[PDB]
């Protein structure tokens, strides 16, 4: 009666009346792996113009700089492939989530790929601005699975379609394309959820705001996050909990109320070793 805590969310969890979580997350999980939101000041991406050898942000995801120059874009795509920065406690929760059978969706607005990283399965993901697994010719179409040009990419060569030699780029959605086709998924998905999750992001632009809503009225909708704003402080609802602050701290209450902590050392352990 009244507001739920996190402490009931736990208890739902540990009851299994929830086990059909959806997951959103964004720039604010992956911070503490060492990679700043690419518009912070100082420190992100979108102020390194340098660096990068970039003649303005947003050139770096645009299809015509990047035929004229795709160095800029292979810079990045050498500093994101797999196996330079390490998924954190934030994103090794969603993995124990997914191992414990309760994971329906994990929607992710970034492109470190470090999901993926932390061994959740593709199928489980929806990685809605694209990833760098896999690439596609930017002339004939051809897919290569990422491994594929990464030799080229760790020696500074921009990679060569085999059949018409045209470069071929990273499954990274650029300016003005569409969406992933899997982003559909979020037809069957929504109204299949028990519990939402959003983790640091706020989900303050569309076609994500909307998503917000799109589960069913008595879901509860748990924000992890260091400030309450965005369409869940736009519009609350009974059963919404907000864990405000250090998303990693946020999380780790979480673990501790589930008692999960022991079982995610053990997790964190293995796989950092790698
Ligand atoms: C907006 S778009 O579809 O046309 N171009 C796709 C590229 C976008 C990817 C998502 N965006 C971000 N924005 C700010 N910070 C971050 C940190 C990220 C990470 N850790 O992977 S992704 C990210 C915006 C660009
Ligand atoms: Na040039
Ligand atoms: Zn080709």
């Keep these: 009666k009244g507001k739920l805590s996190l402490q009931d969310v736990a208890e739902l969890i540990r009851a299994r009346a929830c086990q059909r979580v959806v997951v959103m997350v964004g720039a604010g999980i992956s911070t503490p792996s060492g990679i700043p939101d690419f518009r912070s000041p100082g420190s992100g991406l979108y102020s390194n113009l340098q660096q990068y050898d970039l003649p303005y942000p947003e050139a770096i995801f645009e299809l015509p700089f990047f035929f004229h120059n ?3 874009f292979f810079t990045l795509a050498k500093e994101l492939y797999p ?5 954190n406690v934030t994103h090794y929760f969603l993995r124990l989530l997914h191992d414990k059978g309760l994971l329906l969706r994990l929607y992710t607005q970034n492109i470190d790929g470090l999901e993926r990283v932390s061994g959740i399965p593709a199928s489980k993901l ?5 990833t760098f697994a896999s690439a596609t010719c930017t002339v004939c179409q051809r897919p290569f699975p990422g491994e594929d040009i990464r030799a080229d990419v760790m020696a500074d060569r921009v990679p060569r379609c085999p059949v018409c030699t045209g470069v071929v780029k990273p499954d990274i959605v650029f300016f003005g394309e569409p969406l992933p086709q899997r982003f559909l998924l979020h037809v069957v998905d929504f109204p299949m959820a028990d519990l939402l999750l959003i983790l640091g992001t706020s989900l303050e632009v569309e076609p994500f705001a909307s998503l917000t809503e799109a589960v069913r009225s008595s879901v509860p909708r748990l924000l992890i996050n260091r400030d309450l704003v965005g369409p869940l402080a736009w519009h609350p609802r ?10 990693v701290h946020g999380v780790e209450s979480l673990v501790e109320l589930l008692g999960w902590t022991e079982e995610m050392r053990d997790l964190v352990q293995r796989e950092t070793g790698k």
């Design 83 to 87: 196996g330079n920065y390490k998924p």
């Design 126 to 130: 929806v990685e809605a601005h694209g």
């Design 238 to 247: 009974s059963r919404d909990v907000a864990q405000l602050g250090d998303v």
């Design 70 to 72: 795709p160095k800029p």
